[PDB]
Design a protein around this ligand. Structure first.
Ligand SMILES: COc1ccc(-n2cc3cnc(NCC(F)(F)F)nc3c(-c3ccc(Br)cc3)c2=O)cc1
Ligand SMILES: COc1ccc(-n2cc3cnc(NCC(F)(F)F)nc3c(-c3ccc(Br)cc3)c2=O)cc1
Ligand SMILES: C[S@@+](CC[C@H](N)C(=O)[O-])C[C@H]1O[C@@H](n2cnc3c(N)ncnc32)[C@H](O)[C@@H]1O
Ligand SMILES: C[S@@+](CC[C@H](N)C(=O)[O-])C[C@H]1O[C@@H](n2cnc3c(N)ncnc32)[C@H](O)[C@@H]1O
Ligand SMILES: [Cl-]
Ligand SMILES: [Cl-]
Ligand SMILES: [Mg+2]
Ligand SMILES: [Mg+2]
Ligand SMILES: [Mg+2]
Ligand SMILES: [Mg+2]
Ligand SMILES: [Mg+2]
Lengths: 385, 385
């Protein structure tokens, strides 16, 4: 397809609830939630690893909670849908191994011991970005929104029994052509869609490809974006019976771009799942999203990127910067002043503003952390200036 | 510090060879190299997990090689410097566990079985970006270059015995103020430096902070970038005796931004280490770097971002796009035509151009994959147009 000057292509991907990396993210956040339900101040850094027959928890937790890891892990796998050896993985019969220790006392003393909550230090150094774009109501890139919705539709049709050959492991990828608009972007058309999904031994390739087009793509992607030139790669490997952890090892924090903006904006490298609010990889990224979305919904920008960074043990961010892509009449200095007057990005203040001791994290761990369900970081702050 | 209009701050981080995530990347690539030394066509997808006393290998390998995983893992840990219980980890006495299976036959049949090498399919779907910037000779952002060099200097002074209290686990972070220059960027000054490094029980905080400034920062960062306003956070946690996997679990592919551009450019989410060339997460990212660097060294751009993407089982990229930040006199269409005429981004052609069956991967797995050592993707292609 021809690319008119002033237009361009961009691609993002998403994965389903049973993708092995996403299994790990969901388990790590189920463990976090289980701790927070009993101890709102639990210090949690839980990594999960998945391979054939195995969930391993590894990391550091200091908490007053009494958590039954066997039950928490197995219930999370059950929810995903891995409930029989015929599907490659079974919550009832898999191995759950635990290698969890207390948080390092050296970290604890440098971050939170004997500190006023508002003045707790960042739990690590790092950099984080927030992004928002007015191209969708939820202020997310269309590429990633569509990719997530394709995976959600697969899970829906698996769970409602209308495509009973589906299994839980899936991946999708969407390329959209955009029009430049004074620094903002406007979606024009869908250029290419990829869908791969684990399936039973009985269904044939043609039946699957027809269903993926008619029952999945057409039920998700508006027809105005699809044309005779759109390219479809549906079950492009030809066979995907082996899947889940049996097909590919999973680890927590290996889908960080799926979790955020689908490649748009920028990313500082930190993973979200399995971490309590003192880990700024999560809390500061959520707050940076909240700032970005507040700037767009407040009418100050159409598209905006925010970078923050921290040093371990230091509460205030080391610096904050705002880039508006040419979509604000205010200068970068002016936007920064507005942000500094309206937000306090210490982790011990973010926790209060975004209610980050609440056990809602398992809900964040599939289909992206941003752009859905009116989580606190998705509710814009009314800005004073 | 005041930010003049037309200037801005940007932050990147790096980690040392003994950071637990980086340990895992290095082990995963040591395993890959060991296979490639005997079987250049080995199919390798090796994840590593590290916690107190434990290295676990998990993933999928199909290979004609006979690899002694105990020896390969322990020699990699020895090289890093974890050789005694007093340091928190010891290659001689740790547990090495292996959960490695063959590559899924369903993947194999859809990717490479009975396919001409040049026509092998991508080993997965995904998106990848390449980036280059003329702000340094090696065409990398100064923020990340400096951050890497600070970690390398720590390892040097540990190994040469002049700072014998140092241990292998470290992290660094550098914020630079830049001047905008017609889409390119020009470094002005270093705004903030963070250094945290594991240390012995005997050395005091003041001795460490003085050494980190005088022997590390001053030996790495040109004095012209440092002034009386530069902020230093040196050992900001106050105590870092517990470190390595004992302090924090490590996993392969959890430092993907450290491995690439330090937050500049863009990232598609895929990890590099532990993967052979058929995994486009690695090979196509390397090729995209090669394209970007070729465009800058060829005088066509000063700063450039390239996105490619793939579907599993399909050899050619689904699309390619080039963004030059306003730093080329050529249009995006023209640059794309030049790229298409000069490069072939099928994985089975990338392998030949970049010599990706060679066992050099362990060398890539610390201090970034880009900007050093004249690896094949760092040697620009002479462009014809
Ligand atoms: C005057 O209004 C505008 C509005 C938007 C743009 N604009 C144009 C682009 C063209 N082509 C690519 N290719 C993707 C690439 F990865 F290959 F670069 N990207 C672009 C981007 C972009 C850059 C980085 C990221 Br992250 C995400 C999008 C872009 O903002 C220009 C002028
Ligand atoms: C006319 O010449 C130029 C030359 C460069 C720029 N330019 C300016 C920026 C200002 N401020 C931030 N803050 C970091 C932020 F994360 F908060 F946005 N970034 C910027 C960037 C930028 C954007 C995304 C990424 Br990735 C990396 C750098 C930038 O290119 C503008 C005009
Ligand atoms: C292709 S596998 C990664 C490569 C792999 N580790 C190997 O050994 O070659 C990555 C993801 O793709 C999906 N996948 C697994 N088997 C597949 C298949 N046969 N066809 C298509 N996608 C598959 C799963 O979501 C999986 O987590
Ligand atoms: C701070 S730890 C991550 C948080 C952690 N998992 C916990 O339980 O709170 C992340 C990295 O910081 C470094 N680190 C570990 N202990 C530290 C300490 N006491 N002071 C500073 N940095 C430390 C190591 O490089 C480690 O991999
Ligand atoms: Cl994957
Ligand atoms: Cl880390
Ligand atoms: Mg953590
Ligand atoms: Mg963007
Ligand atoms: Mg940009
Ligand atoms: Mg792989
Ligand atoms: Mg950039």
């Amino acid at each position: 397809a021809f690319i008119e000057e002033g237009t361009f292509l961009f691609t993002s991907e998403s994965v389903g609830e049973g993708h092995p990396d996403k299994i790990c993210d969901q388990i790590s956040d189920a463990v976090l939630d289980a701790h927070l339900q009993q101890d709102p101040d639990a210090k949690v850094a839980c990594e999960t690893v998945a391979k054939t027959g195995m969930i391993l928890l590894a990391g550091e937790i200091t908490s007053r909670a009494a958590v039954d890891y066997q039950k928490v892990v197995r219930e999370a796998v059950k929810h995903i849908g891995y409930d029989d050896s015929s599907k490659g993985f079974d919550y009832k019969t898999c191995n759950v191994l635990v290698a969890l220790e207390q948080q390092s006392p050296d970290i604890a003393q440098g971050v939170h011991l004997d500190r006023n909550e508002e003045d707790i230090g960042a739990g690590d150094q790092g950099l984080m970005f927030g992004y928002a774009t007015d191209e969708t109501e939820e202020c997310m890139p269309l590429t990633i929104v569509l990719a997530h919705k394709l995976n959600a539709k697969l899970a829906e049709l698996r769970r409602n029994g209308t495509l009973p050959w589906l299994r839980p492991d899936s991946k999708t990828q969407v390329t959209v052509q955009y029009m430049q608009d004074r620094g903002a972007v406007l979606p024009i058309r869908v250029h290419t869609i990829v869908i791969s999904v684990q399936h039973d031994e009985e269904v044939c390739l043609d039946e699957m490809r027809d269903a993926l087009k008619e029952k999945v793509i057409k039920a998700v992607v508006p027809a105005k974006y699809l044309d005779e030139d759109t390219i479809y790669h549906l079950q492009p490997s030809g066979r995907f019976v082996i899947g889940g952890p049996q097909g590919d090892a999973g680890l927590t924090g290996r889908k960080i771009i799926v979790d955020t903006y689908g490649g748009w904006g920028a990313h500082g490298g930190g993973a979200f799942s399995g971490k309590d609010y003192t880990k700024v990889d999560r809390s500061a990224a959520y707050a940076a999203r909240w700032v970005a979305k507040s700037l767009v919904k407040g009418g100050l920008c159409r598209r905006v990127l925010v970078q923050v960074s921290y040093a371990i043990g230091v509460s205030h961010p080391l610096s904050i910067s705002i880039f508006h892509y040419g979509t604000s009449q205010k200068s970068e200095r002016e936007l920064l002043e507005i942000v500094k007057k309206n937000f306090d990005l210490r982790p011990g203040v973010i926790v209060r503003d975004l209610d980050l001791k609440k056990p809602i994290y398992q809900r964040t761990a599939a289909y992206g952390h941003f752009g859905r369900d009116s989580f606190p970081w998705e509710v814009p702050k009314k800005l004073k200036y």
